[PDB]
From a paper:
Coxsackievirus A10 (CV-A10) belongs to the enterovirus genus in the Picornaviridae family. The virus is considered one of the major causative agents of hand, foot, and mouth disease (HFMD), which is highly infectious and affects millions of young children annually. In general, enteroviral capsids are composed of 60 copies of biological protomers that are arranged in a pseudo-T = 3 icosahedral symmetry. Each protomer consists of four capsid proteins, including VP1, VP2, VP3, and VP4.
Human enteroviruses from cell cultures often exist in two forms: one is infectious mature virion (also termed “F-particle”), which contains viral RNA genome, and the other is non-infectious native empty particle (NEP) (also termed “E-particle”) without viral RNA genome. In the NEP map, some surface-exposed loops, such as the GH loops of VP1 and VP3, are unresolved; additionally, residues 1–96, 112–123, and 321–324 of VP0, 1–72 and 297 of VP1, and 176–182 of VP3 are also missing in this map. According to our maps, NEP is slightly expanded compared with mature virion (157 vs. 152 Å in radius, ~3% expansion). Compared with the mature virus, NEP exhibits a 4.8° counter-clockwise rotation of the protomeric building block (VP1, VP0, and VP3) pivoting about the corner of VP3 at the icosahedral three-fold axis, and the VP1 was pushed away from quasi-three-fold axis region exhibiting a 6 Å shift towards the five-fold axis, leading to enlarged spacing between protomers. Specifically, the two-fold axis channel is markedly opened in the NEP than in mature virion (indicated by dashed rectangles in Fig. 2e, f). No density corresponding to the pocket factor was observed in the CV-A10 NEP map. In fact, the hydrophobic pocket is collapsed in the NEP compared with that in the mature virion. The volume of the pocket is significantly reduced because four residues (Ile109, Val191, Met228, and Phe231 of VP1) move inward, making it impossible to accommodate the pocket factor.
Numbering used by the authors:
A (entry chain A), E (entry chain A): 73 to 214, 218 to 296
B (entry chain B), F (entry chain B): 97 to 113, 122 to 320
C (entry chain C): 1 to 175, 183 to 240
D (entry chain C), G (entry chain C): 1 to 48
């Protein structure tokens, strides 16, 4: 009877897995790995935050890193967070990593996971996952329909700290908890499957019915 | 006039202390009526669009860089007592149509054309209304501010909607705040000899308007 | 002892964190501070200073003449003298100003700006200019006549040696095809430049601008203004 | 210093736990919230 | 709208990388490594603290040390801080390292980084990065112009603690945070690139223009 | 006299309770005027230098080990109504010129000579004023305490500057507290037949002076 | 128990630091101090 499980905040709690990124060292070409922050990534959390229109919240990321065989070793890692608008690291050794304004967390591989919080980064008063219109003001003469830059939440990048290359191979499960959630002007929740990642597009020929059929209308199971 | 739907239980207001066109923009605009018949699949109007190219309201919106307002919408359906059917009149914020006819790639995915996204004054027509062309379940469209116009009962539907958006001001040409969806849930039926096609008239009053950033 | 439990985020070094680091010299007391005039609290205090724009930057006048825009007798009335886009954060005339260089350290800004003109011609000379501001989304004004219909100031040299124009609002927004449309300010000859005999028939306008009180910045970042990367040695 | 003793449950990451994670940008103040109509508090409001 | 991001203190916050020092053990000739404290080292933080004249602050250093391959091992390190005026260690085994007045931090290589704070060390009431004049009072008869000893902040030195030499090789990234920052009498910020480390000298022939050019004066993009 | 520039909004004061020369040092010193013409590139005076070798003020400064004071500076430009131009009069603390003519090494880097660093009573002249010979952008020189002297308008510029330094007292010979930079932003123009070269006169009053550590 | 998080500077020995080291003999009370003349507080007393 306690209402607290149905509040809009509890419904988005419970940090889940929002992405996974792999890392391998040849040392030069790709010695790093980058992951843009997108909560549309998987279909469970996407379908939940697409039943609303405007949402305002905080993010809390936890980085679980292991090796390919799985057994750790005390190598040091660097998690760089490039806030929206900053250039992304173009290489393991690039000068991007020494930028002071890109926060970082140096944590050894054998430690408990590293954890950080992100504020609400938009210039707008809330995120909006449904935008009807065009981003450009330049009188679009008329694929750019629906995509608003406002929702860029930034990016993480990962490297191994060392002077030479270490031949280990890593993958990083990144769990995201969603805090202080406010939500507005709800929508209906999607019946049809998703096709393209960032767009509502669906399949017109294959449309699936919302309710599984039965024998006859006047016979109830 | 029996029942008005007041969207989200909140009245339009001005900027919470950017100019106001006095009472100059206050008057009814009556769109070309839509002709509803047995096979009609529904219609929609991207709203801060419909008025963009027509009227004194239209000259302001095209010549001003920022825009704010709410609306009052009246949907009337004239028809006899021998006609029957029902329509679902709903105002759904940030209505975004979708590419259908699936081809899933980064490249050839069939995005909608501009004439399909922003229909203009004459509105547009749903290919398959069952999903509202959003991929979403119309049977749940009753979430939004809505009214049933049922020929058996009262034939009018009125809905007041406040200005809603994440920002106080936004462009009138590029961004369409809310769409207006009219669907024929239960199909129109009539006996032989009755008038075949029933008109649908939508009147819209841009109450409580603001503009800014005029362009000479 | 006190039962405790370690949580994730243990043993991590977060560059932007805050906490007391143990003083390497606890018993050391530093030299007490005296009063030095001209202390700076916020960078906004430092933005409001109006500094010279380079409105003539192109491959002709290279030098201190890059700060000056001309006027002459040969130019007929009712034609354009000079124009420049008003944004602090992009390339061109604003890179010389503080407000322009200080906006390189922040991703988002917005507020009102203040553009100011000064006339170096002779005390005997006279004329008029029309200085007008076209808000963003409107293109380059093609004619003085359409320029007049916007926000303008008629500015007569003989009366005022300096004019000022407050652009109402300007800010950046994202989410090179965007190309960040913003307003432009043009400077027109209202009347031809009048000069008496035995006086130079060519003069310079000098333009400078600054932010106003409501101008704000946010989301810090480093500048691309320097590629140097650690001279050292 | 303060004598302490570690207990089981140390160094574990519990997905459903709650505690303050260190803000990656302490000095950042987010855009103040305006009034957007139609806010949803509970899902029950949305069931009815 | 919050002013707090524009305050003079927040602008110098966010510990960045002020230097890096390498260490290798032959055991005798050079078994150690020394780094003088200089915040002019890189060009990002230099250009920021050269837009003022007098500045008064505290320093907070964090020492991130890894091995050449990158994988740690529980070797013990010693970070000695020789305050300004003290003699610097001349060798791994030199008697300089046992001086009581040179503070040290013994920390193992497998630990989280070591961290210390430095007070405001000048005899003057504030640092000054621009000094017009000569340090000498002895009637300079007349390269010594502009260099004031007052800004010496001290030195760090690093060694590995052991009786014999250990053949490992290390480098130390040193991150510096800058606290309680007061700043006075601002300057303009430099247009021209830097040539010499410690001196304003620039290139007279190659002078770069402050604003990128365009087509014509009366055509705006 | 219409407008005085009061540097950093703070007045000169004595030592905040080291001796005072009563009123004995209070009087105007008038430097040799500089002759400004079409191609003139600007001038500067390292200030607690200019007065070092000249006057009763000069004997005190050379014979005392410590020094403190502020100043009051008047810059006049005499010229007709047919001349035109503008100057930028600025007082910039710890003005440090720089070696130009780049050779970047630890050894051969071309540091300035003493006559170039401390010019003396006759001041010096900028090679390239666009960078103020500091490598810094002159277009930003308006940060400092400054005044425009524009021949079209008033021809006088006055600026009071307080004593500023990290220490209360400092040597008068070695350390130059602030320099005085005068640049011809917009070049001088005149019609044929007018007087070719326009004089610039700078008068300086060492108000509120202190000395100490006399040397017999 | 009380949730805690370790910060940099853990497990380091700083020679100039200050903190209570555990007394090797807690129950020992030292000989009470008597009055010995000529006590020195500051070195300045000794410079003059």
């Amino acid at each position: 009877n306690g209402v607290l499980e149905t509040t809009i905040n509890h419904f988005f709690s419970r940090s889940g897995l929002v992405g996974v990124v792999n890392l391998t060292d040849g040392g030069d070409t790709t010695g790093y790995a980058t992951w843009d922050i997108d909560i549309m990534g998987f279909v469970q959390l996407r379908r939940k935050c697409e039943m609303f229109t405007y949402m305002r919240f905080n993010a809390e990321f936890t980085f679980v890193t292991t090796t390919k065989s799985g057994e750790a070793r005390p190598y040091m890692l660097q998690y760089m967070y490039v806030p929206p608008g900053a250039p992304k690291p173009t290489g393991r050794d690039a000068f991007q990593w020494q930028t002071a304004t890109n926060p970082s967390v140096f944590v050894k591989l054998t430690d408990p996971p590293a954890q950080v919080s992100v504020p609400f980064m938009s210039p707008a008063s809330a995120y909006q996952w449904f935008y009807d219109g065009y981003p450009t003001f330049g009188q679009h003469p008329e694929t750019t329909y629906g995509l608003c830059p406002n929702n860029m939440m930034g990016t993480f990048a990962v490297r191994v700290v060392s002077r030479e290359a270490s031949q280990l191979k890593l993958q990083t499960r990144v769990y995201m908890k969603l805090k202080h959630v406010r939500a507005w002007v709800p929508r209906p929740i999607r019946s049809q499957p998703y096709l393209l990642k960032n767009f509502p597009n669906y399949d017109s020929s294959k449309i699936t019915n919302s309710a599984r059929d039965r024998s006859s209308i006047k016979q109830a199971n | 006039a029996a029942n008005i739907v007041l969207a989200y239980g909140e009245w339009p207001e001005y900027c919470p202390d950017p100019t106001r066109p006095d009472v100059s923009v206050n008057r009814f605009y009556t769109l070309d009526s839509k002709m509803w018949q047995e096979n009609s699949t529904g219609w929609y109007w991207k709203f801060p669009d419909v008025l963009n190219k027509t009227g004194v309201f239209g000259q302001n919106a095209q010549f001003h860089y920022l825009y704010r307002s709410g609306f009052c919408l009246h949907v009337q359906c004239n028809a006899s007592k021998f006609h029957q059917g029902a329509l679902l009149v709903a105002v759904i914020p940030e209505f975004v149509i979708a590419g259908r006819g699936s081809n899933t790639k980064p490249n050839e995915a069939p995005h909608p054309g501009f004439t399909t996204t922003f229909p203009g004054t004459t509105g547009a027509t749903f290919h398959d209304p069952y999903v509202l062309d959003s991929g979403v379940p119309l049977s749940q469209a009753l979430i939004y501010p809505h009214q049933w116009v049922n020929l058996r009962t009262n034939n009018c539907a009125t809905v007041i909607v406040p200005y809603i958006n994440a920002v106080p001001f936004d462009s009138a040409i590029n961004h369409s705040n809310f769409g207006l969806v009219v669907v024929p849930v239960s199909p129109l039926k009539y006996s032989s000899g009755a008038t075949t096609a029933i008109p649908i008239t939508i009147t819209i009053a841009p109450l409580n308007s603001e503009f800014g950033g005029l362009r000479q | 002892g006190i039962p405790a439990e370690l949580r994730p985020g243990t043993n991590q070094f977060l560059t932007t964190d805050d906490d007391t680091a143990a003083p390497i010299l606890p018993g050391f007391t530093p030299t007490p501070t005296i009063h030095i005039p001209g202390e700076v609290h916020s960078l906004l205090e430092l933005c409001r200073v109006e500094t010279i724009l380079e409105v003539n930057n192109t491959t002709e006048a290279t030098g201190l003449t890059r700060l000056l825009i001309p006027v002459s007798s040969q130019n007929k009335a009712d034609e354009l003298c000079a124009a420049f886009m008003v944004d602090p954060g992009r390339i061109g005339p604003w890179q010389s100003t503080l407000v322009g260089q200080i906006c390189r350290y922040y991703t988002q800004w917005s507020g009102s700006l203040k553009v100011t003109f000064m006339f170096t011609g002779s005390f005997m000379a006279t004329g008029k200019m029309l200085v007008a501001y076209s808000p963003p989304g409107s293109a380059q004004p093609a004619n003085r006549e359409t320029a007049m219909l916007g926000t303008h100031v008629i500015w007569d040299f003989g009366l005022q040696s300096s004019v000022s124009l407050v652009i109402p609002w300007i800010s950046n927004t994202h989410f090179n095809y965007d190309y960040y449309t913003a307003g432009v300010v043009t400077l027109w000859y209202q009347t031809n430049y009048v000069v008496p005999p035995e006086t130079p028939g060519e003069a310079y306008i000098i333009a400078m601008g600054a932010a106003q009180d409501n101008f704000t910045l946010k989301i810090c970042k480093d500048t691309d203004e320097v590629t140097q990367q650690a001279v050292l040695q």
